[PDB]
Design a protein around this ligand. Structure first.
Ligand SMILES: O=C(Cc1ccc(O)cc1)Nc1ncc(-c2ccc(O)cc2)nc1Cc1ccccc1
Lengths: 307, 228, 229, 310
């Protein structure tokens, strides 16, 4: 698809090496986790969780708006970014959840943490929210994993493609052809990424083979009531039943306009109480189209939940 | 025939001012084309409003019927309209209800096709392939062309190919009006178009499109003594 | 192989139409035959109920079968694959006037002939328009874009009624054809060139005879090698 | 145009010779006039006036409904139908009018006459009523020339066509190709005429040459205030003003639906006082599409006009 550059972005472009030089690493279980830490204002910890095909690089321009308020930590999920690989080589939802909570344990986090989850990164930010319900102060989600899927009514034309990924064909799509990196990522961004910031995303999966396994295992965890993984379906069912009862939990829903999943999940997200709704430009990876808008929005949101 | 102040190969400069929903933007185009064979290639830039929050291919048909290969058996209403040029008003209805209005003027000065275009789109569906940017390009098309007193009416169905392999069509109706009185008006024919995008490698932020348009009648022989 | 599909090169057909144009209800019948290997057909239509018609006849010329379509080897034939069961279609017509038409048809195959059953509805036609004025001489040739959507095939065209004044009156026709059975291979994006003419008018017979030639093909303009789509 | 027959028309079809064997001829100036005469009920006179390309045949199915209430007379205009030819070969409106008045004087008509005009046949009546305002009781008009043509807005796409007719080419269109009888006559009729019904119209102009001059000269008298004949323009203006000032004159307008000229003339017809409006289906030749309903309308309208003696 044809896209054009943002004329005022190469001047403030943050390259991959420039971002990783500001990121730390730390051994977690039988591996390590590369992550970015602002450190300052450690009394409140906000955690930015990326989804599929991305890394901490997704929140490079969103985070400068919230750091002077709270300590913002952004990890690369296991097997993705500059972090290490998982021990067994499996990259399912719980395979990320275990490493992520073990890495949480090594961070000196306050009692109630604040999460910023996007795509599958929201599901984790929700699953933890279901297990450690006393350890959350706020939740900010966008293009998330809200509830299960049962219809495909107002969803993007991703059916059949989902069935293609779930079959052996997807192995050639993602492992050998890098589907979610060479096709899905630049397609669902309204602007044309500069070559450096696109190489920053291609770097973890520039090689063919099993290293691209997470980007293939992430969509295979989709919570389809018909055909989906029963364990993940039950997990999301449980934490959606919990989130619909989170009356005191202040939440923030960022809707990407026009977006990719926003139209299909904004009605299911309205069933979550104490939710403040904002909307702004972008497709799926709305952090690449309107990063400053989102930064100001969530900075104000966290300032007012701290009250 | 340079009596109209033309050449077999002609350069063109197009300036488009567009508004899609609430996004205002300006685009430019520099191109070259054969008006006798009916081919054209234009490099397109976005001089204001970048990036575009919509699919680009909706502006491809706004970026000159002078680049049409008219046979000797069909009157070329467009080449006759020069040296003054010609204007056209274009109404587009997308298959989901979205609408577009394209008002364009085609002049000639030094010996170049100076095109000025105004583009206005409205009522696009957020899940449509234009907002979702699911469009790969344009498929070939056939445009009905017939005379209406002094105007010429063109009408076609333009089909965008989607990333998933499906197609998304829109109905386009254009009224072309010459600036000078044209000698002979055409009967009823079809212009076959193929507008494609070349140089797809990333490189800089510009879109190079090549369109081939050839006018002809139906290839089915009319049964003698039949109507119409 | 047409023998397995219950067909042959030349196939007969009997069409029954029930029409409602504005407030005028009518019933028409057509009998004919045509070549399914060369896309030719000829049908003579007569009015069985509601004669005479206060509207132009040519609006029902498209309701009187894609089985009569000359398909080459490099383009799969959805409609001939639809048989022996047949296929249905839903057609939406918008004239360049605001008036609209809905055409729901079901082409079946019985014994050895196509049994078509069409329902035609029209509304919002203009008093001074060439349909209520009956200024239409006939139908000009057209190009119907045909592409695939999951299990159905979608066609779209602009049909131009020629008028007695030499001018033209267009209408946008969007048809969705659905085979009754799963059907094996789906066709790529192509065109069907149509030419529908009226043969016998110097023969005051009461019939209205129409011959349609429909040939399927791709674009004749060669695609650039570096070309995206 | 295709068109299809009325399934219940051939049962009651009146061919050309059958209708002509019921008409009468009568010397008028240097010629004669063929006309159908009801004779009976001479206390009132309902005169039907056809327009271009037609004859008295046009009213063959309309007249039986009005005969029981008044003497109905329908003539073929000069050079048309089975009537005699013109002396000078000229067929402008004024020659038709002269022959028509000379034939009027020979019928022993009452003082006040009732008129039913179609196309130019209305204008003729419209002319007569202007010059003989003492001799009019009621006027029926359909697809009329109610007024001049100041713009082509609600009119059918007959521009350029009339321009081709008036610009020399009308001779090859009408005298050579028989435009109004072969093309325009069957086109402006919803149903398909039986072969005998069309032969009855073709008979007076079956030959090429000057015999079709009436059908060529009728459209050339079109009242275009810019590009038309100024004498017909003045006649139309005069009788239109007179009809607009005629409150004591009961009129009946029969609007053709969708019609041909009715959409553009029904306004000017509405600006005529004492006009009762009805609507019947059909194009221009509405008589060949809704004859029985038209006859019932005309008969009840004449009935209510005659009922005036309080
Ligand atoms: O010229 C006239 C006279 C006239 C009639 C009504 C009126 O309001 C003003 C003037 N009429 C005319 N003027 C033009 C045409 C006409 C010319 C060409 C054509 O293709 C169709 C109709 N027809 C006609 C009448 C007609 C004749 C035969 C059949 C149908 C109608």
């Amino acid at each position: 698809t044809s896209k054009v550059y943002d004329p005022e972005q190469r001047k403030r472009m943050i390259t991959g090496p420039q971002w990783w030089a500001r990121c730390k690493q730390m051994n977690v279980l039988d591996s390590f986790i590369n992550y970015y830490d602002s450190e300052k204002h450690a009394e409140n910890a906000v955690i930015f969780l990326h989804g599929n095909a991305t890394s901490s690089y997704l929140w490079r321009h969103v985070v400068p708006h919230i750091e002077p308020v709270a300590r913002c930590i952004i990890p690369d999920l296991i097997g993705m970014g500059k972090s290490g690989k998982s021990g067994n080589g499996s990259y399912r939802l719980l395979d990320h959840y275990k490493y992520l909570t073990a890495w949480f344990e090594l961070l000196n986090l306050p009692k109630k943490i604040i999460f910023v989850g996007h795509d599958w990164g929201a599901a984790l930010a929700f699953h933890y929210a279901y297990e450690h319900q006393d350890r959350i102060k706020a939740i900010v989600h966008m293009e998330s994993v809200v509830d299960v899927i049962e219809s495909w009514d107002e969803w993007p034309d991703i059916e059949e493609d989902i069935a293609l990924i779930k079959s052996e064909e997807g192995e050639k799509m993602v492992l050998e052809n890098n589907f979610f990196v060479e096709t899905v990522l630049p397609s669902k961004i309204m602007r044309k990424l500069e070559p450096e910031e696109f190489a920053a995303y291609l770097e973890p999966f520039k090689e063919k083979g099993e290293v691209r396994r997470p980007t293939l295992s992430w969509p295979r965890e989709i919570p389809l009531v018909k055909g989906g993984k029963p364990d993940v379906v039950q997990i999301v069912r449980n934490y959606n039943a919990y989130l619909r009862a989170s009356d005191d939990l202040p939440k923030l829903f960022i809707e990407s306009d026009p977006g990719f999943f926003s139209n299909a999940i904004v009605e299911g997200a309205k069933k979550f109480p104490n939710t403040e709704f904002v909307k702004v430009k972008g497709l799926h990876f709305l952090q690449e189209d309107a990063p400053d808008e989102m930064g100001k929005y969530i900075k104000s949101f966290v300032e007012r939940v701290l009250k | 025939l340079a009596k109209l102040g033309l050449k077999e190969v002609m350069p063109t400069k197009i300036n488009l001012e567009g508004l899609v929903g609430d996004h205002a933007f300006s685009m430019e185009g520099v191109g070259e084309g054969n008006i006798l064979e009916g081919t054209q290639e234009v490099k397109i830039s976005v001089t204001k409003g970048a990036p575009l929050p919509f699919a680009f291919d909706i502006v491809s048909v706004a970026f000159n019927r002078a680049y049409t290969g008219y046979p000797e058996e069909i009157s070329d209403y467009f080449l006759q309209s020069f040296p003054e040029g010609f204007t056209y008003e274009r109404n587009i209805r997308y298959q989901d209800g979205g609408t577009a209005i394209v008002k364009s003027d085609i002049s000639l000065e030094d010996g170049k096709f100076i095109v000025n275009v105004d583009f206005k789109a409205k009522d696009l569906r957020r899940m449509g392939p234009v907002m979702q940017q699911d469009i790969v390009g344009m498929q070939p098309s056939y445009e009905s062309m017939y005379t209406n007193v002094t105007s010429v009416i063109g009408e076609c169905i333009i089909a965008f190919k989607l990333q998933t392999g499906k197609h998304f069509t829109y109905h386009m109706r254009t009224v072309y009006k010459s600036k000078k009185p044209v000698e002979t008006m055409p009967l009823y024919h079809f212009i076959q178009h193929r507008l494609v995008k070349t140089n797809v490698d990333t490189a800089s932020g510009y879109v190079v499109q090549h369109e081939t348009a050839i006018a002809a009648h139906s290839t089915i022989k009319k049964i003698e003594g039949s109507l119409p």
